[PDB]
Amino acid sequence: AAMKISRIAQRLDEAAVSGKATPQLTGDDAVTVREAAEIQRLLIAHRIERGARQVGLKMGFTSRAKMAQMGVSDLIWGRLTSDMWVEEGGEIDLAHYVHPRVEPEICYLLGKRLEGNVTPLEALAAVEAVAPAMEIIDSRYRDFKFSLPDVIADNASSSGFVVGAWHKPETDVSNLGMVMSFDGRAVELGTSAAILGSPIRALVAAARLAAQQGEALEAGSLILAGAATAAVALRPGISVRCEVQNLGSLSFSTTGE
Amino acid sequence: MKISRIAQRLDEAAVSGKATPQLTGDDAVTVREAAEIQRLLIAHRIERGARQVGLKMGFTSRAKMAQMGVSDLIWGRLTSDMWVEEGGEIDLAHYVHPRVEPEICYLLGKRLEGNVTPLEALAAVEAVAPAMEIIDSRYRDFKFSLPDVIADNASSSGFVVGAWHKPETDVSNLGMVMSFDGRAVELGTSAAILGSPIRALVAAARLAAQQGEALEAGSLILAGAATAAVALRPGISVRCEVQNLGSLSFSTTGE
Amino acid sequence: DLNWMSEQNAKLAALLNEAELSEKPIEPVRGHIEGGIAQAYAIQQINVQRQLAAGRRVTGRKIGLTSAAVQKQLGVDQPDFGTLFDSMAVNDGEEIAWSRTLQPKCEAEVALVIERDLDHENITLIDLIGATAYALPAIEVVGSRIANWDINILDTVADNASAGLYVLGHTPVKLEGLDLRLAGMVMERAGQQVSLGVGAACLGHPLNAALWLARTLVKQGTPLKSGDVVLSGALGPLVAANPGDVFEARIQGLGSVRACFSPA
Amino acid sequence: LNWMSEQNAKLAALLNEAELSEKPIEPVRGHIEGGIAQAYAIQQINVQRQLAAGRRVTGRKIGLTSAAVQKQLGVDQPDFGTLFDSMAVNDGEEIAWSRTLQPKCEAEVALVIERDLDHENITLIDLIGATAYALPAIEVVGSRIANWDINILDTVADNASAGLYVLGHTPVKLEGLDLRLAGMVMERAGQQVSLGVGAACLGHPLNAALWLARTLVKQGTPLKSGDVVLSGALGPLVAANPGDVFEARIQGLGSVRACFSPA
């Protein structure tokens, strides 16, 4: 707990609320990874104070190639809250966002609580259903250059999330094709195999990361497993669609200029 | 008095990653003696903050049993610190000299206790999955002793599990390819576990009831090794491919 | 071969033929072979012609040394082949007369039935897949005319790759929808597991060995024909058979087959 | 009309000597003033050289199957290479390092052809009727040119950089197969070295096979029954090293392993 922790959390929370970028920490605002953890918690507390509640988790850096490119040794997670929800098939004004990007993901719905060091086996025993999804991510910082602690403090860019149809939990999601498209033309092509080599691996990691903060994946949680492709900058007046092999598609639009 | 020091030197070896001599003459143990060293051996892990999470059967074959001059199987209790993340990495420096084995794992959805039929056993199973057991004898240059292996907790040390598969999946005769960096080191079938893995689950429950325990709900049971163990070395990708059960893998750190 | 019908080769073939007719294994003939593995195939070939002369029908081929471990113990880096005849054929469960064996040993295998002739040069995997109708779970009963299985590459190839009987299953299973790389194999006798394996043990895949055999047969002028059955190779270790023995082999996704030996 | 020129035979001979000696050579695009047509002629001379050595044309490989790759090479169309019995490998078979030359792996959908497509104006319908089944495949491309320094003239003259092709054993018919959203992952030592989907291969693997079928009919060498068509990259190529084992998985199609031997 510190004056700097409160000052940055509040600065990051108004960037989110106003949709205006905010500068990164340098020297005086330079933060510890441990400092970012506390800022991440206060950033969410700001949202819970406005009536939103925690509803899930999102994993970041869900590939060894990704951790390698950012020089990290583990993935980053973000907390999701009732206010980041987007109606599937709905519209979003880009005006309430700093510079949002869209990523295709696999989502798990927990039917039971999942806690600690779990096997893939035990992870899916607590899963109710599975679905394709798109995460809308938003770095609230202006002129951003990568620093690990900033993204942890900025809640791993959590901002929006949209999910598709219910699918049986035993569906094989290990290597499904994915087509993310703007106005029907593909912007990204890939497979859900991009998420740690097997999406259930991200569900296992989420229980590991959550236990680190003494937390757990509670019954009813929505877990965004991770990005199957690189994110794409969103623009106005577009139809954003995610199509997955054996999972159907999900969509949302952006308001016109 | 004796049992406590053997348990501690055995336990010492595991946290230390350094071998220890077999029980001889003075420290020579009885199966019964070895039984308490095993209980105390797990007690040390408990004390350190880990809990019992499953069982592992050993000598899960009539050929393996007769080859070791025993008339029954042996088992080891699994604890949470032996857990290894699937797709993870392990440092061999933390092991005295470990080997890997491919197995079948059952996740118990309900309590199973006593002398049960194959039918009753699978009624208590939530799901089944392929798995790899990381075994590690704590003895240095081990000349086979039944009491030492019992007392050394059936060499239990590491375990990794694959994906959830429906409990009615027929795992009676599935092909198993255990490989090092994509090249097979062992080739077999799940039929190697007692001629039918469900039999190891049955034996697992008969053996737990032997000491007043039971297979609790949510336990992990490693049915048995379907092939021979292969010694692990640094910088290798270890994978286990099982027919109809997908695959699981973990790496070893390089020097 | 320009001289596969030599006076020496005929003597060795008649020796092996006689050893089989009298039910009496003879001593190793490797000392008498100086032309290498080609001379050994000429000797197997003479005995094939001998069987065709007695009105027997070539029904297929067997593939041996389908593992690198077994290849190494014989000083070679390739498999061997033997010739099957209608008289070696056994159906699942049929009683097997002890007189029909000679130092019998059992091995679970995948049987491939061929429906097209592979007569051309450079046969590919695509050709083989198109010529394979279906597969049967099989048990090969090998036999040696050489006493106490004292054989090297020349003894076995010359002795028809140690062929004996082939027990086939009754239910065909098409290849599409059949994973032969990971198919599990278990052979039991009196409730005991006597042999354990997987499809990958057979040269990585049964079609890997069958492609080898088709290619080798074309080079020997005796191509695989329609209706031929290919005993592709051991999926696990050989188990010596005894009178009264019943061996059951299960190949996950292919089926089961039983080899029942009569009590002599 | 002049495909059998002294210039072309010299270039073909150069690439052929490079393959035999296992030593790559300097780029040849600088010696080709005839465009991609002269490069195809050079490829053709080496195809006849292989046929005259008694080898069998077992199929074709399609290259430049993404607009991104067509754009880097300055083209708006894919390229094609000729496969031979000597270039074939089965799933899991050891690949002798001497069979590669600066090897790279790409996961692809292999389409086996069962009817000749000899006529002009081939349609998607002709291709569907002529397609028997599909197979998971890993193409092992190779370069006779030093350090993969290649333009469209270099690769087309060097058999569109074809090396080996690794095929799986289990066929799957097109009916009940979605090749557009089929997911692709290629791994080496438990790592995801290539990620893709069927749609990455020109939108659909049959769009590439249809392109090839007609290109071959205009070159006087159509697709034939039994030919295997490697339809194109599903993901990015990964450079291969001695002893490497790459495993490719195509959802609904199957898996295939390319095992490189050491030394």
From Swiss-Prot, chain B:
GO terms for molecular function: 2-oxopent-4-enoate hydratase activity; 4-oxalocrotonate decarboxylase activity. Its cofactor is Mg(2+); Mn(2+). It comes from the Bacteria. It catalyses: (3E)-2-oxohex-3-enedioate + H(+) = 2-oxopent-4-enoate + CO2. Keywords: Aromatic hydrocarbons catabolism, Lyase, Magnesium, Manganese. Strongly inhibited by Fe(2+), Fe(3+), K(3)[Fe(CN)(6)], Ag(+) and Cu(2+). Its EC number is 4.1.1.77. Forms a complex with AmnF. This is 4-oxalocrotonate decarboxylase. The lineage of its organism: Bacteria, Pseudomonadati, Pseudomonadota, Gammaproteobacteria, Pseudomonadales.
Curated annotation (Swiss-Prot), chain C:
One of its GO terms (biological process) is catabolic process. Forms a complex with AmnE. Involved in the modified meta-cleavage pathway for the 2-aminophenol catabolism. The lineage of its organism: Bacteria, Pseudomonadati, Pseudomonadota, Gammaproteobacteria, Pseudomonadales. Pfam families: FAA_hydrolase. Optimum pH is 7.5. Stable in the range of pH 5.0-8.0. Stable up to 35 degrees Celsius. GO terms for cellular component: cytoplasm. Keywords: Aromatic hydrocarbons catabolism, Lyase, Magnesium, Manganese. PANTHER family: 2-KETO-4-PENTENOATE HYDRATASE, ACID HYDRATASE. One of its GO terms (molecular function) is 2-oxopent-4-enoate hydratase activity. It catalyses: (S)-4-hydroxy-2-oxopentanoate = (2Z)-2-hydroxypenta-2,4-dienoate + H2O. The keyword Transmembrane helix does not apply. This is 2-oxopent-4-enoate hydratase. The gene is amnF. It comes from the Bacteria. Its EC number is 4.2.1.80. The keyword Amino-acid biosynthesis does not apply. InterPro entries: Fumarylacetoacetase-like_C (IPR011234), Fumarylacetoacetase_C_sf (IPR036663), Hydratase-Decarb/MhpD_sf (IPR050772). Belongs to the hydratase/decarboxylase family. It comes from Pseudomonas sp. Strongly inhibited by Fe(2+), Fe(3+), K(3)[Fe(CN)(6)], Ag(+), and Cu(2+). Its cofactor is Mg(2+); Mn(2+).
